[PDB]
Amino acid sequence: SDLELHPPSYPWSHRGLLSSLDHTSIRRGFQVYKQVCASCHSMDFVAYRHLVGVCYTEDEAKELAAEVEVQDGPNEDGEMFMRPGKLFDYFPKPYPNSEAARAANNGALPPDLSYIVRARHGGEDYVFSLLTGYCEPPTGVSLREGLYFNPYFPGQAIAMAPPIYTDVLEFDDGTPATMSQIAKDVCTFLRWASEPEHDHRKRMGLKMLMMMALLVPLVYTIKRHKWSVLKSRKLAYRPPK
Amino acid sequence: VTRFLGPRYRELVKNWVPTAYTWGAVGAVGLVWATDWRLILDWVPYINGKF
Amino acid sequence: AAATLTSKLYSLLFRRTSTFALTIIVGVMFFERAFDQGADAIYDHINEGKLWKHIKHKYENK
Amino acid sequence: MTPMRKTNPLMKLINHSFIDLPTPSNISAWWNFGSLLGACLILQITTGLFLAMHYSPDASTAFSSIAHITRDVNYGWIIRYLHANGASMFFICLFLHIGRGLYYGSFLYSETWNIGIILLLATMATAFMGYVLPWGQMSFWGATVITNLLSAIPYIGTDLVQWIWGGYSVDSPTLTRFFTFHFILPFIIAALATLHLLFLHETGSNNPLGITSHSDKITFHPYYTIKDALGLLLFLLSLMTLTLFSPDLLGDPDNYTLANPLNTPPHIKPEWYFLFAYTILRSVPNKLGGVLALLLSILILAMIPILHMSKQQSMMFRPLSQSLYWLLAADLLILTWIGGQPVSYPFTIIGQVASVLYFTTILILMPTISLIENKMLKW
Amino acid sequence: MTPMRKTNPLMKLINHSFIDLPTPSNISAWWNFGSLLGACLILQITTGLFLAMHYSPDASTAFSSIAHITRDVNYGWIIRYLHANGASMFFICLFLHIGRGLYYGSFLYSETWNIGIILLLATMATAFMGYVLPWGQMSFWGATVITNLLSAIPYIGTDLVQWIWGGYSVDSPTLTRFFTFHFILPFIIAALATLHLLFLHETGSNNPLGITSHSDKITFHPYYTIKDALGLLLFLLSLMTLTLFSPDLLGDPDNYTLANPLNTPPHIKPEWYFLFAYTILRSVPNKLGGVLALLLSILILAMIPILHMSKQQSMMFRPLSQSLYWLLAADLLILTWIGGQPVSYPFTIIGQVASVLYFTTILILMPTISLIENKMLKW
Amino acid sequence: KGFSYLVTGVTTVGVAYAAKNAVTQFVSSMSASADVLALAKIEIKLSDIPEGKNM
């Protein structure tokens, strides 16, 4: 109803024009996603690869993929079976179809997270504020029993129950688990999942800037050199008298 | 053909030989650089960024 | 009294256009390596610890 | 013994158009965008051709295809962003290319000016069908709204809409034909551009002063080549900065969500370059009124040469006309800004005032002040 | 007031190119196949354009889309057959176009003759990639064989075959990539066709006698517009008979089966218009040597003007050259027939003999007989 | 003269550098998508297959 509360601009480590993404944050962010997120949210456009050079090594990724189970093509002279899974299978979807997901979530459909950051205004800033700020409704508003108040949601009513609290997980790194900490990591991981060319894009930008700095004055100098003959030309008018 | 034989044509080609050598070198070095052909770029003095 | 650097660079190289092209392409060969390496070092120095290549140490070789 | 570029037929054309073209010496930067437009076209063409090798023009796999380009195709993301960002640059140069003629009086070249109007309409169509290809929420619904705008025809109406759609709604058949039309039109624009240059050469370019430049003409190869090579470098600098630092600034989210025929976003605003006309439509409550307004808008450009009354080409020497020009530009800025805002009381009234002010200034104020200036000069 | 067609820029080109350029009065029907080729090109674009509105370039949906076009889409079947059969008519006209030049000495126009060779190579590329679009059993294997035949290139072959494939096999990426090339290439051919005419126009057309016809030139419009219209009517007659009565005679069945990667058909053969070359490569024992033969051949067409040593342009007054020309035509017929037959001792030797006979005729026999004919007349 | 030609000579170097890079991007896009490589050549296989058996 009322104009939605605009999230504030947070100091992300990659807000800078030339900064990059802390890859340890992405590692812990994915760790959060593996169980807390994948219950009903899905990442349709991500594979167990794309992580070999980002967070996890070759062997660790393969071992991690072995922990899942996919369904394989029809056995010759047979039927479908179940395969362990290799480094070309996308992340498991939680439900066979959208309608089944709606049934298990009071009719609400959890959007795919692959492009959520670029899909919503504010990007990760919006998500971080959304994950936190799960306060109670003010005086004078009521909500359906299966909905929760959130001032950052455009309708202030959301079917998402608070998903993250303290001590839900235990990072192997030893970093203490804190609602703010988990939110920061997962938001960074999502920003990557929607833009894995972030670091490369900015590196090329850096080279472009230095190359332009060298070139623009040089090309202007050549232009002035050729045009000098015209810019210094002097004229005179000498009629017969 | 038959007419091109003659002493002065020999003089002309001898004049232009060095220019052809330079252009041939330009083409050769440019091709390897554009294609980053490793085998010849592995014998260069310091350009060994490849592993 | 020594002849200026540019004058020597002109007579030996720039006077003949074929040599002018040859020196250009060799300079490209050399400047490409130099510029690329310098820019990469700057970018890494801006983001120590963030880039995963600096993180491999904590977990590698099992 | 004589030069070989004055005998070979293919070199005669290049010599006429490029090397020995007599061109005024005092032309400013405003005369560079012409070249840039073609350059941008040449870029778009090549950029798009490479995107076509991995795009599936189907309603069920188009969105997934783009996701695959930006995550699996080597340097696919940069190619996609260059295409998207290069389209906005096209319009920016195109608007500045048209403004120069309006200010300096280049419209007096009837033939060339009319060819441009056609080129503008062709480019506008190309950009609209390109923007629907990604098959995002904005793409799907933007096509629906703009395509339902032909129902205002008195007696035919639905027939054209259903004919274009290839069905009762917007679906795969519409996507496929738009893909083909998107592919082909740019090459048609290239042919039109050659006709544009053809009629231009008979007379030559117009200098900023508006006086005959036949006494101060210079060749094009040594001077304007480097001058137009510096402009293209700046053009690339701007384009690369936009792509490599703010890839999604002149766009809009909800294009990264799959199109849903059932759900509809609230604002559903079109692309920035198609915003001034959008406000003109909403300003008139009637559908037929709005569509006529949109068309009457472009038609004004064709009528502008007929509305000229001053005895001079350039407005450089006519300051009152200059002030009116800049007020008209500000009005266009207001129209664009309003297009980006939701429908509400202040915006609606402001849009109506801007629309009427737009038309009145062109159709009434400009001729009147031109006559007034002729009076103070004792012409 | 003088006619406007001699003052308007756009009308000057049309007047020069079509209405009023002098032409020989005696040119026979052989000189009518050039105009038909362009007409066919025009016909091939429009039909293909409509097919592009429904075709889906994917490994799985490509075959399905063709079936959908043939049955569900209105008049889809007729459009597809016009496109398919128009291709064959295009090559028939193209061969007759080339044949006329070889017989009447038109190759003396070097600039025009060389451009023609490029048009032929481009045409073949367009036709070869188009044959892959149906994605039938023959299309898949035809592309496989004609592409694997670049692994013979000294050191880059293997690297330049996977790059073309976009992978380590022939799959959907090849299909989409070929689709874009199929679309774009014909338009380049159209542009090149304008360079062909341009270089021709600066000298004028040839006549059967081989003597200059400046004494008896005629305006092109009335006489030859109706004559070319008659030719177009006859060309349409042939095309419609092929499509409306026996559409599939000139095609090869087994293309109506889904492409099976793990099933090599017993008898793989190219299309009828490409068979002559297939036999020239299948005969040479060396794989690389066969590629060098298929190329050295096509290019002897570029060498014809050098090997010319007669003192008469036209072979009309050269009875011995006529006998060789028809003998060479018969040799091409033999090569075509062998191309469609399985490998075996009789066909192989016949193909080998035909190949050597083809080459030696063009190189030695024709120059020698021309010299003897010159000696006979006491030049 | 040497100074002026030096400017031109240096400028071309920059133009050349970018040129090569740009082309290598467009050409590389046609080589092979990452998924093609992932699905191909990935055929690690255990040696545990008994004698005569064919897995």
Ligand SMILES: COC1=C(OC)C(=O)C(C/C=C(/C)CC/C=C(\C)CC/C=C(\C)CC/C=C(\C)CC/C=C(/C)CC/C=C(\C)CC/C=C(\C)CC/C=C(/C)CC/C=C(\C)CCC=C(C)C)=C(C)C1=O
């Ligand atoms: C049995 O299986 C097989 C088949 O069946 C299934 C087949 O189908 C085929 C056939 C192959 C088919 C598809 C594949 C082959 C494809 C190719 C060779 C070509 C590769 C390219 C393509 C897609 C791209 C095509 C290229 C295009 C558009 C680029 C050209 C663009 C332009 C504007 C053209 C511009 C040209 C201009 C300005 C130049 C102007 C001048 C000229 C013509 C003048 C000539 C100049 C000269 C020097 C020549 C004159 C020479 C003189 C005097 C010397 C004489 C010469 C001698 C040689 C003696 C094979 C091999 C096969 O196995």
Ligand SMILES: COC1=C(OC)C(=O)C(C/C=C(\C)CC/C=C(/C)CC/C=C(\C)CC/C=C(\C)CC/C=C(/C)CC/C=C(\C)CC/C=C(/C)CC/C=C(\C)CC/C=C(\C)CCC=C(C)C)=C(C)C1=O
């Ligand atoms: C013997 O002597 C002779 C000579 O020697 C003296 C000669 O020299 C010659 C000349 C030589 C020859 C012809 C030979 C070839 C040589 C040539 C120069 C010509 C070369 C050929 C070409 C470039 C090809 C020309 C074209 C072809 C096939 C046409 C392709 C391009 C097109 C425009 C064609 C049209 C396609 C059309 C319209 C599509 C059909 C669809 C239509 C109704 C539906 C379309 C709908 C839309 C766009 C909808 C858009 C909607 C939009 C934006 C939505 C808007 C919504 C709103 C609400 C506003 C001859 C003949 C001769 O005999």
Ligand SMILES: COC1=C(OC)C(=O)C(C/C=C(\C)CC/C=C(/C)CC/C=C(\C)CC/C=C(\C)CC/C=C(\C)CC/C=C(\C)CC/C=C(\C)CC/C=C(\C)CC/C=C(\C)CCC=C(C)C)=C(C)C1=O
């Ligand atoms: C201000 O003052 C000025 C003026 O006024 C005074 C002026 O007037 C002007 C006048 C000039 C202008 C504005 C300039 C612009 C003018 C115009 C009209 C604009 C025109 C624009 C164009 C034509 C667009 C140009 C670009 C186009 C079409 C696209 C170009 C690229 C391509 C087709 C693709 C090229 C190739 C690419 C990327 C390589 C990738 C592909 C491959 C290798 C191909 C893969 C293989 C295949 C097809 C296979 C082929 C072979 C096969 C199957 C088999 C072979 C055989 C076997 C045996 C295997 C100026 C400059 C000016 O300043």
Ligand code: HEC
């Ligand atoms: C684990 C952290 C977590 C993140 C990050 C996350 N989800 Fe969701 N999510 C939903 C549903 C249902 C919606 C749609 C409406 C809503 O939020 O209730 C949604 C919506 C969202 C939205 C915004 C929707 C919009 O339209 O703006 C984001 C962002 C999101 N999820 C991400 C079910 C879940 C469930 C299943 C219990 C879990 C667990 C869950 N969500 C946990 C998470």
Ligand code: HEM
């Ligand atoms: C859409 C693609 C277009 C291209 C590729 C193009 C191309 C060009 C070029 C290269 C020039 C020469 C520039 C100069 O000499 O100043 C030019 C001039 C001109 N253009 Fe366009 N143009 C396009 C669109 C338009 C449009 C939409 C108009 C609208 C009126 C237009 C009107 C003109 C006029 C009047 C001139 C002559 C200017 C003068 O004589 O000073 N053009 N065009």
Ligand code: HEM
């Ligand atoms: C003036 C010429 C052109 C203009 C103005 C133009 C404009 C556009 C625009 C604005 C988009 C959507 C960008 C986005 O959604 O981010 C687009 C998409 C596209 N265009 Fe064009 N385009 C032009 C020429 C071409 C050509 C010649 C081709 C030939 C293949 C082409 C192929 C495509 C493709 C494949 C897409 C899909 C974009 C995607 O998948 O992300 N375009 N075009």
Ligand code: HEM
């Ligand atoms: C592929 C599309 C082609 C088109 C649209 C085309 C068009 C034309 C036209 C309209 C003419 C004049 C009228 C006529 O001769 O009937 C002509 C003449 C000519 N063509 Fe083509 N041509 C094409 C390909 C070729 C090829 C492959 C060659 C190979 C040799 C060629 C060689 C010639 C020559 C030598 C002439 C001069 C005829 C003369 O002087 O009498 N053309 N062409």
Ligand code: HEM
């Ligand atoms: C000289 C110009 C052209 C030639 C020689 C040519 C030739 C061919 C050939 C031989 C086929 C095989 C069809 C079959 O075997 O059933 C084909 C298919 C096709 N071509 Fe064309 N083509 C030309 C122009 C075009 C153009 C301009 C387009 C689109 C703009 C196009 C689109 C298609 C499509 C969609 C198919 C698939 C039809 C099918 O699978 O039956 N073609 N082409």
